[PDB]
Symmetry: C2
Subunit: 387 residues, 2 copies
């Protein structure tokens, strides 16, 4: 499903992918990369099958991808009507019924009117004379683009930061921006126990405040609750993220957290969007204090930087280490980095090693002299473009 990777021959190991038979939909694009345009006159694919698995394997060759569905109570339809009656375009209920006539479900050829009542129960809409008007919670969910199923929990979770908040460490702030667990990694309970003990006093205060139990944490799982289970994984996700925003080595997290670098950036990129949705959610809800704390946490989670390097990182060519070594060079803001000597940044970038050998996302490799010039050159354009 990624970027086009042309190749003359494509080989598939088994019709069974991860204990399940290969889907036809991904099989069409499985082979579709075979054959380069204007270079290779013949492209081929060799699916590999054994014993009785050949009968299952051949079915994909003569099979066709399944026809599309609409997937539309349904959780994907609650947002559908919340996206239109809160924007103000559709207000009357009868006109809303015509919207359900415009969807994929209607075009393919009851409970739509019974689903707006679900939103009525959860305060998402106020009932008037029927003509519907959005509420404070309803308009905040739409602006932040959260699923209404998740918002009901967040609203009761964010409001539980009113009772008690900690500010010495970023953990409690991070706990409210960790999206979920999904299946980003396989948890290691015994490894979590050793980490649980070594946590300083300040961080352990956070866990007790959000439902995580010191008495039960990597204790009963060894010897052997869905909402309780999704909190402990939420806490582990927040523990990993705190090391990410502390700029600890990514290799060191592997040796300490058990999850490799592949699932780390697939989480810090996913958790950075969450911080960008909680901040907007709190903005429209009139919580000006909470928006202040989470305002800077979208930039920190994306790049794994501290508060100091937030301004340096605005340059697109400084991801996580090209700004730290540059920060130690006496350059603490992007305003004066724009006026840096071109020959000065060459030597400082040469050091800190853990002709097109330096790399920048989007332009493949680059040489050190050009990229260092690009560091200043991008900083020139930022200074006057935003003012």
């Amino acid at each position: 499903s990624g970027v086009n990777l042309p190749a003359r021959r494509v080989i598939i190991r088994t019709p069974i992918f991860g204990g399940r038979p290969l889907d036809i939909l991904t099989y069409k694009q499985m082979v579709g990369r075979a054959g380069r345009k204007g270079v290779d006159t013949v492209g081929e694919s060799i699916l590999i099958c054994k014993n009785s698995e050949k009968s299952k394997g051949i079915a994909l060759l003569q099979g066709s991808l399944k026809p599309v569905r609409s997937c539309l109570v349904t959780g994907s339809m609650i947002r559908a009507i919340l996206e239109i009656i809160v924007g103000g375009v559709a207000s009357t209920s009868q006109d809303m019924h015509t919207y359900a006539a415009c969807t994929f479900l209607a075009a393919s050829m009851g409970a739509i009117e019974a689903c707006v009542m679900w939103l009525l129960e959860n305060e998402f809409i106020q009932s008037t004379e029927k003509v519907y008007h959005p509420t404070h919670l309803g308009s905040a969910t739409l602006s932040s683009s959260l699923s209404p199923a998740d918002t009901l929990d967040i609203f009761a979770d964010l409001q539980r930061a009113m009772k008690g908040f900690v500010l010495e460490n970023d953990l409690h702030i991070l706990y409210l921006v960790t999206p979920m667990f999904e299946d980003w990694t396989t948890i290691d309970w015994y490894r979590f126990f050793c980490l649980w003990e070594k946590l300083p006093t300040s961080m352990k205060r956070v866990a007790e405040l959000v439902g995580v139990e010191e008495g039960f944490l990597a204790r009963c799982v060894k010897g052997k609750q869905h909402r309780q289970m999704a909190i402990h994984k939420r806490f582990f996700t927040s523990l990993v993220l705190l090391d990410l925003i502390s700029e600890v080595p990514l290799r060191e997290i592997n040796q300490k957290y058990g999850c490799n670098r592949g699932q780390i950036q697939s989480l810090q990129q996913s958790a950075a969007v969450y911080a960008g949705m909680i901040t907007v959610f709190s903005n429209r809800l009139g919580w000006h204090n909470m928006e202040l704390l989470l305002s800077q946490f979208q930039k920190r989670l994306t790049f794994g930087i501290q508060r100091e390097l937030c301004d340096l990182v605005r340059v697109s060519l400084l991801n996580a280490q090209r700004a730290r070594v540059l920060y130690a060079s006496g350059f603490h803001t992007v305003a004066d980095l724009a006026r840096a000597n071109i020959v000065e940044v060459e030597v400082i970038l040469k050091n800190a090693v853990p002709m097109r050998t330096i790399w920048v996302t989007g332009r493949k490799g680059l040489t050190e002299r050009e990229a260092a010039a690009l560091i200043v050159e991008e900083a020139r354009m930022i200074l006057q473009q935003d003012l």
Copy 2:
């Protein structure tokens, strides 16, 4: 379904009882009281029906009560296997299968073996070599005779008194002994709002500690969550009980709490059993401090007395006022009350008025001279029978 009340003629108002048709089972005993033994030679019943309701009414006359069922995942079967494998009589799983052959379900003519796994998940039983052995939670539930469905919540609720407990007022202790809400009374939200404001500083601290919200209490219900709903009614049940154990007038509770005297004693008798099950539950679980606080709360909820009159009330003829007025007579314990002058208690019992005119449960009416003598006479027998 109560005590036999003979009468020569029985009249029923409607075949519809409380918006529902009358059940045949209660109808058999509904009329069964007609005709006194040896006095009335003829007993009759006249069901009253109107318009088209006669067709529904006559069906009961020619109808027969439904045949019995077994009502046996099922919540009434989880306790069944827990009642036998924790007592130690049945240990091997194969013998347990013979127990399911001995029940009403088997005699009437699969999931039984799949239900012990449910107990395995919730730590109720430890798995050994299959031979099953009870755990600390499993043996505590059986001794206290609680349903295993309710225990899982109580165990996590009683253990949440570990974090923080209050001792100035009996509210938090009472909150953990209020059984449920069921349908004991119809709640009055506006009346609860006025009561919520006038609550003192000490009692309001309890509500925040158990999940009741000051911000949301008789606030959103007026303008318009099952576990959140079962807590707010639990709190109202605890507020009512605190007045009961404060010996406030029962008439005054009606004017203040909206629930009449009928549903009060039908709750303080039901909540007194709960305090007698939580205390035993905490005893077997090795919580010696919690058993200390709840030890005296079964006697207090039964009789609506304070701590002072606990010893006086041991006499079966002192319910709630015959001990309070007697307490003010300088008699503070049942030991020295047993030695009271017989003529002395006559005058003190005559006063405090809110020949068989004084009433004692179980023996219908009584005269003051005899009952006052019975007050001392019962106190004689207690002193040496328990020593």
